Enzyme design. Structure first.
Site, short mmCIF file in Angstrom:
data_model
loop_
_atom_site.label_atom_id
_atom_site.label_comp_id
_atom_site.label_asym_id
_atom_site.label_seq_id
_atom_site.Cartn_x
_atom_site.Cartn_y
_atom_site.Cartn_z
N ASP A 1 0.85 -1.19 0.00
CA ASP A 1 0.00 0.00 0.00
C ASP A 1 0.90 1.25 0.00
O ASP A 1 0.71 2.16 0.80
CB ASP A 1 -0.91 -0.03 1.24
CG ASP A 1 -2.06 0.95 1.14
OD1 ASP A 1 -2.53 1.20 0.02
OD2 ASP A 1 -2.55 1.55 2.14
N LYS B 1 1.38 4.07 -1.32
CA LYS B 1 0.99 5.32 -1.95
C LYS B 1 1.59 6.51 -1.22
O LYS B 1 1.96 6.39 -0.05
CB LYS B 1 -0.50 5.42 -2.03
CG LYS B 1 -1.25 5.21 -0.73
CD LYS B 1 -2.65 4.73 -1.06
CE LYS B 1 -3.58 5.02 0.10
NZ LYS B 1 -4.64 3.99 0.21
N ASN C 1 1.07 7.52 2.29
CA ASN C 1 1.68 6.77 3.42
C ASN C 1 3.16 7.04 3.65
O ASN C 1 3.83 6.32 4.41
CB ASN C 1 1.43 5.27 3.24
CG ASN C 1 -0.02 4.93 3.49
OD1 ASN C 1 -0.66 5.59 4.29
ND2 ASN C 1 -0.55 3.95 2.78
N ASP D 1 1.99 3.18 7.85
CA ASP D 1 0.88 2.32 7.61
C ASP D 1 1.30 0.99 6.98
O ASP D 1 1.10 0.75 5.78
CB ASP D 1 -0.15 3.01 6.75
CG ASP D 1 -1.39 2.18 6.57
OD1 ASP D 1 -1.35 0.97 6.91
OD2 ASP D 1 -2.46 2.63 6.07
N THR E 1 15.82 -20.10 0.23
CA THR E 1 14.61 -20.66 -0.34
C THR E 1 14.61 -22.17 -0.16
O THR E 1 13.90 -22.89 -0.86
CB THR E 1 14.52 -20.28 -1.82
OG1 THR E 1 14.62 -18.84 -1.94
CG2 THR E 1 13.20 -20.75 -2.44
#
Ligand code: NA
Length: 298
Positions: free
Chosen positions: A123, A125, A128, A145, A165
């Site tokens: 998120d 953006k 934030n 956030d 991994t």
């Protein structure tokens, strides 16, 4: 016993899942932010784990306290007092490519660290990425956030980083982690483009329809020449084209952005003012429209 140590003040931000308020540390008269999450609506364990493990980063919002009264979780962090980073930068008429490169370096260094530890933000953006105070220095930048961020992990719940991994993570958890990481960098692309020109690459304002924004995103083409672009570096336009690349497989990684000559040779960039649109509030609505368009299947 949140309230035995902190006095609650006014809302900083509200939504259907959590509420953010200013609070005061009763013992010290220091101001903080508290994010209050309804545990019945949402499970904040991943967010809290992420801020505990990684919030000592100088440019990630720092966690100061956590409380849980069974029903709400209370996540106390440093209070951002410098406002949203892009909005302040769009309101500085003498901002330069050299300053924009220092800003992107600080933010991309932080994301490189998070991706290398198996965290994707999901998120990222502009709204934030805030400044903690008004000193204007890249040191005061905070990524905020982490409420949609995810730690990479194995089927048996083991934390993983993308270097080791040798334990089973399902290929669909792995593939989606590579998409999610590339969307973190595309958002830094949307940030760079707007900082350099004063407008957003895929939306002109809040009333752009979601379909026409998504049509532009799917075109994989945007202007890098014209009034607000004509005087900007080629190396900056190169970076932007490669951060906003429509195929995540060809889009740059945070590691590859930091090796780009626009970040590496910051001392060969203009110190004089960019030539930009001056419509910070229109860009706020265009930015909201863009992420509204992308997140409609959330
Ligand atoms: Na921090």
């Amino acid at each position: 016993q949140f309230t035995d140590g902190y006095e609650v003040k006014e809302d900083i931000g509200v939504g259907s899942y959590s509420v953010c308020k200013r609070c005061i540390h009763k013992a010290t008269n220091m101001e903080f932010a508290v994010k209050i999450i309804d545990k019945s609506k949402r499970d904040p364990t991943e967010e809290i784990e992420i801020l505990l493990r990684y919030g000592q980063h100088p440019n990630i919002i720092t966690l100061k306290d956590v409380y849980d009264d069974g029903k709400y979780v209370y996540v106390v962090t440093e209070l951002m007092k410098g406002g949203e980073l892009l909005d302040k930068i769009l309101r500085q008429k003498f901002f330069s490519e050299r300053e924009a490169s220092a800003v992107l370096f600080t933010i991309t260094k932080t994301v490189e660290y998070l991706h290398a530890q198996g965290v994707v933000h999901r998120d990222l953006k502009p709204s934030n990425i805030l400044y903690v105070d008004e000193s204007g220095n890249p040191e005061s930048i905070r990524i905020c956030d982490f409420g949609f961020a995810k730690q990479l992990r194995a089927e048996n719940g083991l934390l993983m980083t993308p270097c080791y991994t040798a334990n089973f993570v399902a290929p669909e958890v792995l593939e989606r982690q590579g998409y999610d990481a590339a969307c973190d960098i595309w958002s830094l692309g949307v940030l760079l483009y707007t900082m350099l020109t004063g407008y957003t690459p895929f939306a002109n304002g809040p009333d752009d329809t979601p379909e026409e924004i998504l049509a532009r995103i799917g075109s994989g083409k945007f202007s890098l020449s014209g009034g607000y672009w004509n005087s900007v570096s080629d190396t900056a336009k190169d970076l932007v084209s490669k951060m906003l690349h429509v195929d995540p497989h060809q889009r740059l990684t945070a590691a590859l952005v930091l090796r780009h000559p626009w970040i590496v040779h910051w001392d060969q960039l203009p110190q004089y003012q960019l030539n930009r649109q001056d419509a910070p509030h229109l860009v706020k609505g265009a930015m909201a429209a863009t992420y509204s368009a992308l997140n409609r299947n959330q």
